[PDB]
Amino acid sequence: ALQYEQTLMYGRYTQGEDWIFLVLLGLLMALVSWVMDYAIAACLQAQQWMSRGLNTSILLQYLAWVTYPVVLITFSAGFTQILAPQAVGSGIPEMKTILRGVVLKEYLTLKTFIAKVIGLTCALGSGMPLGKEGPFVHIASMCAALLSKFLSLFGGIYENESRNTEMLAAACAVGVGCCFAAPIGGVLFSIEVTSTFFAVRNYWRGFFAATFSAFIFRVLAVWNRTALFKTRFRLDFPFDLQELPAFAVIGIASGFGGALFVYLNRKIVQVMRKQKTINRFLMRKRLLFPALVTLLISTLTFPPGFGQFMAGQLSQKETLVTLFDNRTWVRSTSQAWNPPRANVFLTLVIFILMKFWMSALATTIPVPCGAFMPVFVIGAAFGRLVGESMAAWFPDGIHTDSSTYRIVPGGYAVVGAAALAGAVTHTVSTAVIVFELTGQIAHILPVMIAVILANAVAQSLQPSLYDSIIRIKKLPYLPELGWGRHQQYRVRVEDIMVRDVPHVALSCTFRDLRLALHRTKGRMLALVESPESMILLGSIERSQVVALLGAQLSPARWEEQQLDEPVNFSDCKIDPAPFQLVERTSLHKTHTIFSLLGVDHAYVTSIGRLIGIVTLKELRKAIEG
Amino acid sequence: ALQYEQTLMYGRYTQGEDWIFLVLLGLLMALVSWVMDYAIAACLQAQQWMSRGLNTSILLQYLAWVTYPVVLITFSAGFTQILAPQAVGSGIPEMKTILRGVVLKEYLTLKTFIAKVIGLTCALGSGMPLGKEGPFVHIASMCAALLSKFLSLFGGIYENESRNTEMLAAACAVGVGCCFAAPIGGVLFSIEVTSTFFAVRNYWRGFFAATFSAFIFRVLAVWNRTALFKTRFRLDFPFDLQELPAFAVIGIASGFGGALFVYLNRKIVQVMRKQKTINRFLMRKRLLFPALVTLLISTLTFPPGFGQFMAGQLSQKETLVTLFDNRTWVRSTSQAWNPPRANVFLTLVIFILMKFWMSALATTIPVPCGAFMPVFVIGAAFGRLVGESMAAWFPDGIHTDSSTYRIVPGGYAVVGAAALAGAVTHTVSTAVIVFELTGQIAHILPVMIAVILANAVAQSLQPSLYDSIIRIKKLPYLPELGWGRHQQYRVRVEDIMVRDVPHVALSCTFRDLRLALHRTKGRMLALVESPESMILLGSIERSQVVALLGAQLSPARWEEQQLDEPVNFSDCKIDPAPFQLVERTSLHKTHTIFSLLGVDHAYVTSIGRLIGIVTLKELRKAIEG
Ligand SMILES: [Cl-]
Numbered sequence A, B: 001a002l003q004y005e006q007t008l009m010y011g012r013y014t015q016g017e018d019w020i021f022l023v024l025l026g027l028l029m030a031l032v033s034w035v036m037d038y039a040i041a042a043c044l045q046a047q048q049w050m051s052r053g054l055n056t057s058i059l060l061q062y063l064a065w066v067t068y069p070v071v072l073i074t075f076s077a078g079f080t081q082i083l084a085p086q087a088v089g090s091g092i093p094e095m096k097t098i099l100r101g102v103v104l105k106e107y108l109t110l111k112t113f114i115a116k117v118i119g120l121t122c123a124l125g126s127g128m129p130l131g132k133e134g135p136f137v138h139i140a141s142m143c144a145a146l147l148s149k150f151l152s153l154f155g156g157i158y159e160n161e162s163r164n165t166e167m168l169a170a171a172c173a174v175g176v177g178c179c180f181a182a183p184i185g186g187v188l189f190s191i192e193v194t195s196t197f198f199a200v201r202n203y204w205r206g207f208f209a210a211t212f213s214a215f216i217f218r219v220l221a222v223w224n225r226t227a228l229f230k231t232r233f234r235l236d237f238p239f240d241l242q243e244l245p246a247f248a249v250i251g252i253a254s255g256f257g258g259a260l261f262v263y264l265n266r267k268i269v270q271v272m273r274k275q276k277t278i279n280r281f282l283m284r285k286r287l288l289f290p291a292l293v294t295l296l297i298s299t300l301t302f303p304p305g306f307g308q309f310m311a312g313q314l315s316q317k318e319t320l321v322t323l324f325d326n327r328t329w330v331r332s333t334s335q336a337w338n339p340p341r342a343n344v345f346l347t348l349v350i351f352i353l354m355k356f357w358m359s360a361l362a363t364t365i366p367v368p369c370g371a372f373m374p375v376f377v378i379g380a381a382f383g384r385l386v387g388e389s390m391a392a393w394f395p396d397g398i399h400t401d402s403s404t405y406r407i408v409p410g411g412y413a414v415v416g417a418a419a420l421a422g423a424v425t426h427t428v429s430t431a432v433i434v435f436e437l438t439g440q441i442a443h444i445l446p447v448m449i450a451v452i453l454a455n456a457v458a459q460s461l462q463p464s465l466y467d468s469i470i471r472i473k474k475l476p477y478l479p480e481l482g483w484g485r486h487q488q489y490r491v492r493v494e495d496i497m498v499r500d501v502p503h504v505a506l507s508c509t510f511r512d513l514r515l516a517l518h519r520t521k522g523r524m525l526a527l528v529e530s531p532e533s534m535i536l537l538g539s540i541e542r543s544q545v546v547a548l549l550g551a552q553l554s555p556a557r558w559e560e561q562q563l564d565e566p567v568n569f570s571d572c573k574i575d576p577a578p579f580q581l582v583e584r585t586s587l588h589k590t591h592t593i594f595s596l597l598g599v600d601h602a603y604v605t606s607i608g609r610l611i612g613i614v615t616l617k618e619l620r621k622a623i624e625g
């Protein structure tokens, strides 16, 4: 049962009914998502109306431009701090930890729900580079937990990793699907990021609930007024051969850029911690840091100033719509991306760089925020840059004669966005996500090629963004196995296990019991039938063995030496050791046991003897090295 | 291990290196698939040429129309019987069994490869209602095995289940993708039919190899000479919000029909097994059953006779093309579907019924064949029937606001095809498969609704086709847990385990060993430290224990050689018992352990004391009841 500890950036953790459930879950998530999107749109409309309402001078315009987001972010941070501090940042690493059996103290309560909803609505109502995929996963999980509490549904199960898995996994799928407005892509994306082994049954349940959410969204849209970023490209040979190398280059560069983004985020988090005086000073005044970051970012996007060279007038939706259009800029979209004192290439480059560092910095402030849409937009810009370069180099066409069939620079943007998002998140379901978002499937082969290349390059350099956050927040972490090297198949348990394995016997006089407990820094002590045979029987928890010493050594009626020879273990609570290891088990079989069986450690036996132990620490050392 | 036994229909079973591997696998599978498609096209073209060439008499036309498929089927059956009898069937149940660690004697060899390829080419060229998805899975796995033999790979792995999965999961994904010309949908479909838990790493590897296969296919197509069944529907309001109940009805009807199809296939297999004299007479002349079935089916599809009332002149591809067209028949597409003596409704109904029973019977014959395309075509016909009925009931449109938007009966056909295929195979990836096949995503919501409803109903009624075939072949069978009842969460291990476990002690005087071996019938016997303590240590196989007993009772250098002194277990082999269960373990965790860890039994221990055992049979009864 870990407990949250507040920090400047992120934080730290220290020591017949199924169908009704799914229908209600989908309906609730659809309604919540609709209300929140309405609120965010209203906030953005208010921002624009105030921006154009007071256009007296540069001073007043700048004051409004920098004072609206600062106030919104400050209110969001203060409200989150007062209600529930644990509800800041992305909620995907935390739910991945929870689905492995770990318990977080108050992660799925009602105050956390209210704080996350209000904080996300206020934080996305400004113009900061933030997403909402992790927050939506967490919100859907809280919806599922409250629904299960209302009608008692999963109380029968005994294990933690089995009771949580069903409802929470379906909820994660629904949350991603409602965020992206893409059911199948959302379910596939949620499977990849929140687990390693996923049952087909839970895939079916997520599919069902996501379909119901999509139906509710369609009914609401018809009742009021593909869906998000529909593109209109020509269906007659949209791309030719001899253009595939461009998509391969996009994929490789996207892999490198995604690794760099994850590294920059971690480096930003680490540097602030090392600086001590600044850290304490900012900890006394918590609200200063989000406000200072917002004021720095909003000043550089002021349109009359430096914001004209990076298309600072457009919103995130407007930016994504203009980059996906079916027009060639080299031969509103252009007017925003073509300033009178600049080209489209310079504007695209400046947008890419500035948005890169801005998003990396902004995704660390203490508000409920995500990181999918920023990197999606950066990838779209990079793809558009490559596509415009290709169109400028081949004005008439690439395939033999002119043939009236020229390069479509929007397809390159569609490819690059998915490639960079997949490189950052370590997923390949961004392909299906972009197919559902754009409403067209013509550029399927280039998208797949770029996404696979980006994943292959990125996995060889850095962990996923969520794995990085897991490492930062000091949460339990199993390292992902590896791809492209066959040296892991020759590593066995006998070469990574530790033969210390502190233990007690059945005889186990208090003289013997005291020495073993203080000689180790672990959490549990193994139990053996006899020190001659050392046959494993189970474990004994640290908080219990001290009670065995405490209950005996407590004042009762020098005398301290009259209470050591015997022992009692019938009154003790001995947990079993069902899953063990053999000397010749491989590294891959060990990884499978740790990931899905809900265990943290495993004991190695020959026949019944206790020869060594393997913990998560040895697994990290073996996999990394 | 298991060995193949020949019966009438299905048979019985008794008793960076990774990058190079994936690239070579993709290239090899693409080349083999291209060659097979060319051969099948040539055979079908020869059939059409023979049919068109002679018009002298009706008798000669009938003779040719019946002689060609009979000759092809007889040659395919004879060649497959001579070379490798195990090559007959679907190939997916056996690969799913192999992926769980079970060893089939000669399933992946070179003779089996040759037999499968030639038999599939001859059987698919006849024109019978047969598919090629499972055979493609088997061929891809054989290619992967031969390639891993040529490049010494995956030798370091110790366990069979861990070693087989790494090499064969990507192969199965590539096989399905090459069969359907749909990379993503093929990978997803292969995950669902061959496993219960699938890692994300193998998903990435299958994605990579499928992308390379798609690239090779595109290169061959465009450069040496997309959307196999391409559809062209209007993109402005393809369907209305009032037509969703029609798609729901299609889904439920498809679920019922898929369950019925599986039941009929099983009943056909069973009913001919219980006849003794007929079965023996058919085994004496084996080639008489496939020839009789081919003669019966091809007679009824003769266009001058009964074939005109069922559109027997069209091939499978031509049948699927006309059902997906963008025209309304009620108002070569409707020419074959509108005979002078009938109309479209009667022709569609007769086609549905005839192809239903013909496909079941043809799938139960001993040639390399599958069952995906026939059920796809039946679903397409049912969808077209519903769409035509809807368009005839609303000639102007479902909404009177404007008459521009009317019903498109092709979308109904696509929805019905996906729904029935998913109901039969118990998969939801048929949605993505049909999106990739038709090249459009406009009908995504109705397709998803129908597919999920069909899956729910069919899963509630019957097992899938592959599970049914596994049961028929008497392969090791692990039933699926279930969906929508919630009563499985109250079942614990204590309620399903048996308390009489055959076991021996460490002392084990030879009389005790004899009595224990006599009292048991299982494969192994548990080993306990002592009858007083009952501490589990491992197991002894039947072969080893009978070998020890015989060696002790063998003539040693009336009968005083009984020699019933205590046994010596040091020289014996004791396989460990790593994974055990406690009395409060749930049904779901037991199912997870059985499915993922590659075990067929598990012992129940309480502080090391043996108290029971759980095998596959007890799990089957618990899940079924
Ligand atoms: Cl997002």
Ligand SMILES: [Cl-]
Pocket: B130, B131, B132, B133, B179, B370, B371, B372, B373
């Ligand atoms: Cl098929």
